[PDB]
Amino acid sequence: LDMTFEVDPMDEPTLLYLLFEVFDVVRVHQPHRGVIEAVYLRTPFSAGN
Amino acid sequence: EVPFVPPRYMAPTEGRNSIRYSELAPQYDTTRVYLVDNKSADIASLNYQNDHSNFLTTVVQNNDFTPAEASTQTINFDERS
Amino acid sequence: QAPDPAIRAALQSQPSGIASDDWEAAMQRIMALTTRNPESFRQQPQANRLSAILEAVVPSRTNPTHEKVLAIVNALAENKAIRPDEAGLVYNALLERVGRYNSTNVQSNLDRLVTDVREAVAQRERFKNEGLGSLVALNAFLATQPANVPRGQDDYTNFISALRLMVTEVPQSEVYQSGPDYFFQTSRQGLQTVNLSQAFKNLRGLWGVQAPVGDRSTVSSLLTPNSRLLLLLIAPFTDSGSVNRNSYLGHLLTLYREAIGQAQVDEQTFQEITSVSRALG
Amino acid sequence: MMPQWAYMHIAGQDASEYLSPGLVQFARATDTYFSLGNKFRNPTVAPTHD
Amino acid sequence: SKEIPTPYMWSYQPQMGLAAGASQDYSTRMNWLSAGPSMISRVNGVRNHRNQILLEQAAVTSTPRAKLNPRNWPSTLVYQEIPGPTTVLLPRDALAEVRMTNSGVQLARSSFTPNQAYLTLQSSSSEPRSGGIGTLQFVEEFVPSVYFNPFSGSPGLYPDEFIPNFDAVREAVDGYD
């Protein structure tokens, strides 16, 4: 993916802030009295399991 | 009579010995993962209060991802083992 | 009919001539047993006369998985589970899925499933031809207004029977429909002749009312054209209890039975009269 | 007077009653993207004699 | 209204000989908006009587068919011209002319020989035509369609081939692309 943003000039250094909209989600399991186990997912822009 | 010719099959690609990563193929059985002081300003943003005796680095080395971009990704071994 | 899904997989996934599957025929090309041309294999150049013997004496082993999965995908396409243009990415989605978790267990229940989808495809055409999806919808409609409780006569029982009979018989699958609210019969799938059957709120007060025979244009000549259409549609299923004086409804049925008779004898004599169809008079 | 009023929808049936039911289904099914509701008259007659 | 619908009027495509969809008879209709209840009821009765003669005429003159407006017509449903055999009468006793001229004579039913021959030819085209249909068949097909309770069923069973750009072979509508 390529994106070109055209923007007005500013006398100070600035940042383009992008939000790639995504499904960032978790599921949480609690099978025994002493424990909690979380499964994460982020569908585009993933970070594993 | 006729000859019996049993079928071939593909070993399971997320098998019990698979070593998964999101952007590439699964490796199997063994690899290397490397814990090295990656200097560049993207990872130096985590070095700031630190020194070489206690530091945060990225083990993810997919060269078209910048070290910041790659740092949030994950290496993900088979949960059955 | 819709074809065999496993034939239509094998037909597009497998060798066109001899394979390492049809060993029994290869061992009649070899050995010169083939009665139609015994000496043909004897005349092949050594370059392919010898390699053919190898693949017959020690057969190549193969992976069958792609033929199993495609025999599912072709079935899913024919049963209209998936759009035909999804078949390449549904094939791939299954191939990665069953290769990711591959085992002798999976390989067996793909085989079980190839028989199941092959039978499901054969059953689905029966389930469209038998019209059962319409007969269930009619049987649901008959719960909506007073079953087995008319007033002026029980010719209402014969008319209800004529609906079940007609919707069983008529082979273009006359579609009974729940609508959004009211129940409908479409008749033929091109719909021109749809009846709103919950609008037999006419044909309630009319059971038993005797025919005012001398002139149809009279005080009780009420029926909406939607109701006249239902009578005209069922007419070839209706002698039981409907004879003229039994009701105005019986009289309408005795006219519409013969009006249909008139239409098809005038077709038989029109297709005769039009013999030349071109200038000769 | 009444067919004029039932034909210009001043009296009689609701849009949920005079429209072909296919259009009524289509309307309900697409009403959150592209709303056809404002395009049909609903009459609201008052109770008369009692 | 749903019980006294206006008829759909089928259009024709002279290149193809196929029906180019249909639309209601928006060009034969009587304004009743200044009539009263009795006068309006006669307008309805006069339109009911029309709807009957259309359903009746379709039953008497139409090939009975499962698909409305089929995009090809079997050769058995088309009207072929079937003209009778051609018999020609041959101008020459050709065998007599060669033996005559070899003996030295010269030429310009042919008085030196009594013989004639009549030769009969098939006259009709060598395979029965199939395709679309001509205007005389088209008008004996395609009688106006009276659609009661119009658009009542499920989509996929609406009379889609009324739509003038529906590609009836594949349930899709013919775009510009």
Tab-separated table of C-alpha atoms in Angstrom, chain C residues 232 235 252-266, chain E residues 56 59-60:
chain	number	residue	atom	x	y	z
C	232	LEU	CA	-60.223	-20.761	-12.081
C	235	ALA	CA	-60.976	-25.854	-11.414
C	252	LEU	CA	-68.724	-21.022	-10.844
C	253	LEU	CA	-66.722	-24.281	-10.660
C	254	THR	CA	-69.042	-25.945	-13.267
C	255	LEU	CA	-68.491	-22.941	-15.576
C	256	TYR	CA	-64.677	-22.737	-15.052
C	257	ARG	CA	-64.173	-26.522	-15.535
C	258	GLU	CA	-65.858	-26.166	-18.935
C	259	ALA	CA	-64.210	-22.786	-19.744
C	260	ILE	CA	-60.797	-24.523	-19.362
C	261	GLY	CA	-62.212	-27.354	-21.535
C	262	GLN	CA	-63.222	-24.742	-24.151
C	263	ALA	CA	-59.749	-23.094	-24.094
C	264	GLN	CA	-57.862	-26.391	-24.770
C	265	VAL	CA	-60.314	-27.619	-27.492
C	266	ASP	CA	-60.042	-24.153	-29.120
E	56	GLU	CA	-58.156	-16.279	-22.441
E	59	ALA	CA	-54.336	-19.743	-23.417
E	60	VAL	CA	-55.631	-20.073	-27.060
